[PDB]
């Protein structure tokens, strides 16, 4: 029904995502099918490791000021091992939790291949032949502790990844230049949409 | 029929919202159920009072450079008195207006309690202030040059004895001169409560 | 089914849009009916002409630093000739006619015009050239702003920038937005 229209991490998940070390972050990600598009809400809380309490006064150097979170999917839209996200409670919605057994197909939640193809290569190619690197991307900000003063550059990228031997991918890249002092990585919620693959 | 999926202020409301004084603003808010989430559009036009013509040259102090708008809901998703918004024309859609009499239940439009709870030495147990928030900008007169910091907050409020809450907090640092508070439209989504 | 709920340019279009000269850009626009609202994604790639390789070092003037893209619709939500977008591959998902009032921006919410609202008809945001944080472009989406041809409805994408970009193709990041829909 409306349960099988949503593919999520529970709305209040247990640590389920690797940012620096195993299960160091809670990624809340909801994918809902509104017709041909996926409406998505995402937020990220890191609870231990490198990013659990950002301090770029004591750690300048860019590896403490950016990180990414990859979802990698196979042909059937199943979630692959290289993924930042743990697949245990990443499944179709069931009344505020998930379905019993793991899901066998989720292609209709995948970013559309035509709209977001995995390589783009311009030159030798006519103008009428050219494709869009940028189209594959949403560039926005999230705000740490929900504070306007603490922005984090956020690029969501569709089918950017080749890791494992994935067909589909959603990649959240976070980065900042402010030198934050004892700021937990606790993101504001972020709404976005992409064009869906057909079955 | 398909109109039971939408809960709105109507698309063209009469002044229906307190910002500084009684019915001084028109709040346009549409809530639509897309599956497990609420797709929402909001805009705010203030037509009289403190914010009808911002001038922080003549009033520099902070209280003339920020304000909030609270929607407070009970257990059944009915609107409480503490709310900034008047309940008279806030109801399920009917063909570009609203249904005749008020409805008593709208829980499925409420911000999810699990995702956005009211809230601790332990990191791995702790819950997220920020998750409950969307931080963005609206633009006065729809002008890129006139930004307004906008925080939407789910279940932040305790006023009256509300279970659910949507809070629009506006603030600015630019000292605007004779700029009406006329916001650009703002799309957002939140995860919805389920109705047992 | 949900085919008739989507009105798009197709997800990977052939050049289909005038920015400066005929068919000089690929406009990707998806409109989906989620209840009373339209959920939309838009992105623009210009492939030839004035904006195919922006350089405001060599062309500083205003006309090289902004442009708009107009969709003009009649009473039935059919696409009119004055439009920036070519009508040939602008149709319901899986292909052909438009008769598509339910995808139009609501007249009450967004009229042609105590007080009334300039802003309400507008969404003001940024897109990013090449998907690069460093290359912002001021973007205003406007509903029923246009009078060209004899349109009833209109969607207008206005892009503008002040940064002096050097050999930057106009390749926009995707942009999600919603508006209140007209009833049939």
Numbering used by the authors:
A (entry chain A): 395 to 593
B (entry chain C): 395 to 513, 518 to 594
C (entry chain B): 395 to 489, 496 to 513, 523 to 593
What does the report in the manuscript say about this coordinate set?
Here, we investigated HAdV-D49, which previously has been studied for vaccine and vascular gene transfer applications. Here, we structurally and functionally investigate the tropism of HAdV-D49, focussing on the fiber knob protein as the major mediator of cellular attachment, and evaluate the potential utility of a pseudotyped HAdV-C5/D49K vector to infect a range of cancer cell lines. We investigated the tropism of HAdV-D49, demonstrating it uses a novel cell entry mechanism that bypasses all known HAdV receptors. We demonstrate HAdV-D49 fiber knob has weak affinity for CAR, although it is not dependent upon this interaction to mediate efficient cell entry, and in fact the presence of CAR may even inhibit cellular transduction.
To investigate other closely related HAdV with homologous fiber-knob proteins we performed a BLASTp search using the HAdV-D49K amino acid sequence. This search revealed that the HAdV-D30K protein is highly homologous to HAdV-D49K, differing in just 4 amino acid residues ([Fig fig4]). Residue 338 is not surface exposed on either fiber knob protein and is likely to be functionally homologous (HAdV-D49 = Isoleucine338, HAdV-D30 = Valine338). We further investigated the effect of the opposing charges at residue substitutions 339 and 332 ([Fig fig4]) by modelling the electrostatic surface potential of the two fiber knob proteins, based on our crystal structures ([Fig fig5]). The surface potential maps reveal that whilst structural homology was high, they present radically different electrostatic surface potential distributions. HAdV-D30K is significantly more acidic (pI = 5.57) than HAdV-D49K (pI = 8.26) ([Fig fig5]). HAdV-D49K can be seen to have much more basic potential around the apex where the residue substitutions are. Thus, it seems probable that the interaction requires the basic electrostatic potential. Structurally and biologically we demonstrate that HAdV-D49 knob protein is unable to engage CD46, whilst potential interaction with CAR is extremely limited by extension of the DG loop.
